[PDB]
């Protein structure tokens, strides 16, 4: 489970460094950032999969239809592929807890 175990605050520092260094290539976070290879994740918390507008997503994005909260978050982030198979976010996946807290402190921060 998720809403068990999951999400506790972590380090904003520590996850802000952590999206640029493995985020930041393919997605920009704050508010008015364009899409690029990923979309702009402003705003990610109160929105479900598949939804920025003038991107072009999957279709098994759109249809597994999450509605993004920090549970989601960290299981996405644990291996994509594994979350929405059929997903094309090339990205091998945070393993660690610790990793994903810190990450996802920061993300709920600066998508607000
Ligand atoms: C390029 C090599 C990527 C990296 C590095 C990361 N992401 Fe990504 N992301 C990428 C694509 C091409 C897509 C769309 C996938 C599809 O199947 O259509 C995504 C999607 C996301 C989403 C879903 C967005 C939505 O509007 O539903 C999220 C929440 C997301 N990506 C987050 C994310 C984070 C936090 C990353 C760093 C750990 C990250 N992505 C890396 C491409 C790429």
Redesign the pocket.
């Given at each position: 489970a998720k809403e068990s175990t999951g999400f506790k605050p972590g380090s904003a520092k520590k996850g802000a460094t952590?999206?640029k260094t493995?985020?930041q290539?393919?997605?920009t976070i704050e508010e008015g950032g364009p899409n690029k290879?990923?979309?702009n994740?402003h705003g990610?918390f109160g929105?479900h999969?598949?939804?920025?507008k003038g991107y072009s997503?999957?279709d098994?994005?759109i249809n597994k239809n999450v509605k993004?909260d920090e549970d989601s978050?960290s299981e996405?982030?644990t291996n994509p592929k594994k979350y929405?198979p059929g997903?094309?976010?090339?990205?091998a996946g945070?393993k660690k807890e610790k990793d994903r807290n810190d990450?996802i402190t920061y993300?709920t921060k600066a998508a607000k």
């Open positions: 952590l999206f493995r985020c290539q393919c997605h290879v990923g979309p994740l990610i929105r999969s598949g939804q920025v997503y999957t098994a994005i993004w978050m996405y982030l929405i997903t094309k976010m090339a990205f945070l990450l993300m």
